[PDB]
Coordinates of C-alpha atoms and ligand atoms in Angstrom, one line a residue:
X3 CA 53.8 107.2 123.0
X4 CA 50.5 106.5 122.2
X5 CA 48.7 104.1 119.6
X6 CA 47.5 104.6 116.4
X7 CA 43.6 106.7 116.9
X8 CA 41.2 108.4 114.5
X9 CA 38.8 111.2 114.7
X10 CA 36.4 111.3 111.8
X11 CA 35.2 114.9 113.3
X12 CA 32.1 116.5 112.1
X13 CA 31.3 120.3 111.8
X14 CA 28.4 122.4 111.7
X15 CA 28.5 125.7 111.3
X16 CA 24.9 128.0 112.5
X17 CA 23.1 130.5 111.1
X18 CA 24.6 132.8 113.0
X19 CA 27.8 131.7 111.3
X20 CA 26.1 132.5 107.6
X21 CA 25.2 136.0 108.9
X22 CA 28.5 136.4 110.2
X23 CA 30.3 136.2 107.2
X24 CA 27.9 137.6 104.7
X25 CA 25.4 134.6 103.2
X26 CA 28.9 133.6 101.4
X27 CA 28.8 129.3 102.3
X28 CA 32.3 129.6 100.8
X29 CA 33.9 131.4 102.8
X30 CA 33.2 129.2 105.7
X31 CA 33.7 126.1 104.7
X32 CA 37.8 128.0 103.8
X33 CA 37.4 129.0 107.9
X34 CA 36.6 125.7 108.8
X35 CA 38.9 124.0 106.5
X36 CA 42.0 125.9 107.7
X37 CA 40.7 125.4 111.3
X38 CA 40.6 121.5 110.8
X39 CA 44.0 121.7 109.2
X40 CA 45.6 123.2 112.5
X41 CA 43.2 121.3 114.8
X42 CA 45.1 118.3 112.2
X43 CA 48.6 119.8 113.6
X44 CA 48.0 120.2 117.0
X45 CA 46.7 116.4 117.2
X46 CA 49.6 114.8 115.5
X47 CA 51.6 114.1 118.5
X48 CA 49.0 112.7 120.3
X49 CA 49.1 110.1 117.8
X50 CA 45.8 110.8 116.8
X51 CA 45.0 111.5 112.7
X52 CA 41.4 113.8 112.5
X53 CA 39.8 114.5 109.6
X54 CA 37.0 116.3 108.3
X55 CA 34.2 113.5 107.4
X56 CA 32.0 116.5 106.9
X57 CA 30.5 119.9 107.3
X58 CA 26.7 121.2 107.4
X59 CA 25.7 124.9 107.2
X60 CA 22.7 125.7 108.6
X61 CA 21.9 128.4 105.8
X62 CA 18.2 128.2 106.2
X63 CA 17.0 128.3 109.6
X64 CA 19.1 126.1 112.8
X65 CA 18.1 122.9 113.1
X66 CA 18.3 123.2 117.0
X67 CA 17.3 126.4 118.8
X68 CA 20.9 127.8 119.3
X69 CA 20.7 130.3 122.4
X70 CA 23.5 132.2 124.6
X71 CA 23.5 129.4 127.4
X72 CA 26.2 126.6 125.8
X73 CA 25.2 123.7 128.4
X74 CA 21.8 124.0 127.1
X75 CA 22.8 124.3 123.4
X76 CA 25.1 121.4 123.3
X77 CA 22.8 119.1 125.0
X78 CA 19.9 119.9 122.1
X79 CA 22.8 119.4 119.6
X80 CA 23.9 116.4 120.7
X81 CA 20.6 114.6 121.1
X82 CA 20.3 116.4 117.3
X83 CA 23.4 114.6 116.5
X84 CA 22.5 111.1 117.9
X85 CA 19.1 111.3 116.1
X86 CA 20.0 112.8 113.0
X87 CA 23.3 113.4 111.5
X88 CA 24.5 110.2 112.5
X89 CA 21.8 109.1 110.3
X90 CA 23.3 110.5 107.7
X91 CA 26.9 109.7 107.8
X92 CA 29.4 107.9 110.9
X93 CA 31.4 110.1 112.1
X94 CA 33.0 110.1 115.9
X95 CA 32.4 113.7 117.2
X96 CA 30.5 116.7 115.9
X97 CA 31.3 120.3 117.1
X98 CA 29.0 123.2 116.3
X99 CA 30.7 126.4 115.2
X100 CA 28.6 129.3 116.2
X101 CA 28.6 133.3 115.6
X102 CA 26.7 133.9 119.0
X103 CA 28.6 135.1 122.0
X104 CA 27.8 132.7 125.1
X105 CA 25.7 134.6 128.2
X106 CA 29.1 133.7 130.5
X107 CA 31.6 134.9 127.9
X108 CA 33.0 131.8 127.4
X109 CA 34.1 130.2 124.6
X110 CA 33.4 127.0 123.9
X111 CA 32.4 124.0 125.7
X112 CA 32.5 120.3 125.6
X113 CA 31.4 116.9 127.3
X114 CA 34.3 115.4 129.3
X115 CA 35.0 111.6 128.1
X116 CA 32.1 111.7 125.7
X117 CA 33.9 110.7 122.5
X118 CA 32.3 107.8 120.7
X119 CA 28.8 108.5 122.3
X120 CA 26.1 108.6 120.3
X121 CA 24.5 111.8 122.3
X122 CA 28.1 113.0 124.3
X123 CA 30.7 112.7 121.5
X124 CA 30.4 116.6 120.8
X125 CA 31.7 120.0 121.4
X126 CA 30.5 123.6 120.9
X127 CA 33.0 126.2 119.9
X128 CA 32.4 130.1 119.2
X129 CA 34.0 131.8 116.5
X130 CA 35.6 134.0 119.1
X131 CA 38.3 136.0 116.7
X132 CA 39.2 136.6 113.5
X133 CA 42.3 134.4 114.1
X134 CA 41.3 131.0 112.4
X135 CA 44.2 129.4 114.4
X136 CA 42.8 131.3 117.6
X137 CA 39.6 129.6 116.9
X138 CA 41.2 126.1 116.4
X139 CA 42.7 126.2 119.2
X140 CA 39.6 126.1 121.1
X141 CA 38.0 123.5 119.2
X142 CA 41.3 121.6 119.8
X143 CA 40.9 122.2 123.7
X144 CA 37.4 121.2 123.5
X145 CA 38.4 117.8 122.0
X146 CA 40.5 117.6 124.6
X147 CA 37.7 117.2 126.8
X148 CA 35.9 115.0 124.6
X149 CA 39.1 113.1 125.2
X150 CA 39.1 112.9 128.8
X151 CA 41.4 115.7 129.1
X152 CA 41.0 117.9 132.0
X153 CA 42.5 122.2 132.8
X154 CA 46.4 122.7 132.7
X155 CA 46.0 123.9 136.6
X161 CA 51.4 125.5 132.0
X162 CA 49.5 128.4 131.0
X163 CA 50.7 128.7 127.2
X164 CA 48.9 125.0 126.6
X165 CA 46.1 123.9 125.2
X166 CA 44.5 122.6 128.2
X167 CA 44.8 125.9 129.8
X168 CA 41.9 127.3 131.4
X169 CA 42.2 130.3 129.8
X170 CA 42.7 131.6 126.2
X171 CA 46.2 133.3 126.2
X172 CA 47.5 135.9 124.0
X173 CA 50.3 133.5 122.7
X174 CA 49.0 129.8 122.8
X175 CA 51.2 127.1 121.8
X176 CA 50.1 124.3 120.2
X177 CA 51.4 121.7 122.6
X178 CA 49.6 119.7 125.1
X179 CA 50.9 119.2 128.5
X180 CA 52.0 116.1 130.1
X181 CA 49.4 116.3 132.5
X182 CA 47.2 116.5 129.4
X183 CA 48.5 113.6 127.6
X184 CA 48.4 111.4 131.0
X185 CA 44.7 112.0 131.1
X186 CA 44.5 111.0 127.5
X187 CA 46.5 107.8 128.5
X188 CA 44.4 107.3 131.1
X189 CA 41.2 107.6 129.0
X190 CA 42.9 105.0 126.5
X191 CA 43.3 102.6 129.4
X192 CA 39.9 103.2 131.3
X193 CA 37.8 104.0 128.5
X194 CA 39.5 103.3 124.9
X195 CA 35.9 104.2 122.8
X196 CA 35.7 101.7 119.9
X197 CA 35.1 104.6 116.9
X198 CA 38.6 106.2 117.3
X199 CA 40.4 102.8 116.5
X200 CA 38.4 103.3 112.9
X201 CA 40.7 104.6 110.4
X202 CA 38.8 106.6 107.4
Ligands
ZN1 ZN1 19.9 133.8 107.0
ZN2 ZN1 23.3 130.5 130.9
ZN3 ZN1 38.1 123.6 129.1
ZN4 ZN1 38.2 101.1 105.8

């Protein structure tokens, strides 16, 4: 249905992250690896291949202050992201996985058609359950945004607005028309580039 697209996605995981799970750096990278392997699944149809062009752990100190409020949060990772880690590497999109629950109980959050910008073209997701696939799910329906996807308003989707207790891992045709339409009004210029 749709042409050939890449996402060379970045990850970061916080210090929160490290605290989380103990100081052990290798047990998250296995988290995030599994995650990107489902967020690999759930993309397939789309037409879309993502891979994992790399991950930082904050194991020190955060890099950006990192604080309950996500809209403030993602906007001091992205301008971090423009300025700094895309010094060090291309990459299309960087998400920040953090430990710390969000002051609205959400779960994530993302900027709507931002994929490819240098300062837009990221997502935040929280490590919201001990289900790795639970979690990729999110970081999935935050990509969505990133890729002009808007709310399944299907309620088992990955577009839905809310987090069921049984999500699928199918996009709805709503969701894929958005993504079409994104292709056609947008179609960003990093996602054509194959690893
Ligand atoms: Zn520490
Ligand atoms: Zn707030
Ligand atoms: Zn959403
Ligand atoms: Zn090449």
């Amino acid at each position: 249905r749709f042409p050939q697209r890449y996402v060379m996605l970045a990850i970061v995981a916080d210090h929160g992250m490290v605290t989380k799970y103990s100081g052990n750096s290798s047990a998250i990278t296995t988290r995030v690896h599994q995650m990107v392997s489902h967020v690999t699944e759930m993309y397939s149809p789309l037409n879309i291949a993502t891979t994992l062009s790399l991950l930082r752990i904050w194991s020190s100190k955060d890099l950006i202050t990192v604080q309950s409020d996500s809209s403030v949060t993602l906007g001091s990772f992205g301008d971090w992201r423009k300025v700094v880690l895309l010094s060090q590497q291309a990459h299309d999109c960087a998400f920040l996985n953090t430990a710390t629950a969000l002051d609205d109980s959400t779960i994530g959050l993302a900027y709507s058609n931002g994929m490819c910008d240098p300062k837009f073209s990221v997502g935040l997701v929280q490590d919201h359950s001990s289900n790795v696939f639970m979690v990729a799910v999110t970081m999935t329906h935050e990509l969505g945004h990133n890729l002009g996807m808007a709310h399944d308003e299907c309620s088992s989707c990955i577009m839905s607005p809310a987090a069921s207790s049984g999500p699928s891992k199918l996009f709805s045709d709503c969701s894929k028309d958005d993504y079409q339409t994104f292709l056609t009004n947008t179609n960003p210029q990093c996602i054509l580039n194959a690893p």
